[PDB]
């Protein structure tokens, strides 16, 4: 799971 950056 990727960290939210947008």
């Amino acid at each position, epitope marked *: 799971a*990727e*960290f*939210r*950056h*947008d």
Partner: antibody
Amino acid sequence: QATLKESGPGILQSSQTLSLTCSFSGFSLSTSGMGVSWIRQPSGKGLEWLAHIYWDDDKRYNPSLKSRLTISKDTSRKQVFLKITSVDPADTATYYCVRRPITPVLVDAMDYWGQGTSVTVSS
Amino acid sequence: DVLMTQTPLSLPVSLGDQASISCRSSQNIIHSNGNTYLEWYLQKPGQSPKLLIYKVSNRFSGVPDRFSGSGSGTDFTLKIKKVEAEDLGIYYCFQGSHVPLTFGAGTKLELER
């Protein structure tokens, strides 16, 4: 620029609930792209990321701690909160709240850190 | 979890020397949005960490140009030229791409004798 300042109990016993508060100034957490993370330094060493809250109340957690952590905010009091249930001695650490904006903000990184608050789990 | 391995863990230098810290991740820290969220932080004695470098090689405002960061994929380097007393402390690399966000163990920059 921004200022963050953590506060906590100082000391508490294992199995109790740790409530941390972070007071912030110099920016609005409700502004698009703004968010705040909580970081800790277990014992005197290392750094561990705990949780993050975004301007729109979206929330992300260290998956191994998800069940014990709750992050929340009250922008009307210029405060962010972290709660950790059922603490044990491994939770002894200095806790930092830190600003970490994402896009639209150009600097996506932990750019402003609080001075931190020491927490000791002990009976 | 993305393991961030820093080399060396202790780095003794003389004032004026250049210092180099390596950071290797267990996986590619590029994000699906094309950005690589690798940051460097400095924790001086008695202080909280402060930001030095973000997205691999961008110096945070106020950080002297003798600090520089580079790399890609899984291999990253912080270089500090002209080391002075105010640079001494613990340097951490950090990845902001994959949950959980993770730090390196910390590299202590210290004096030679």
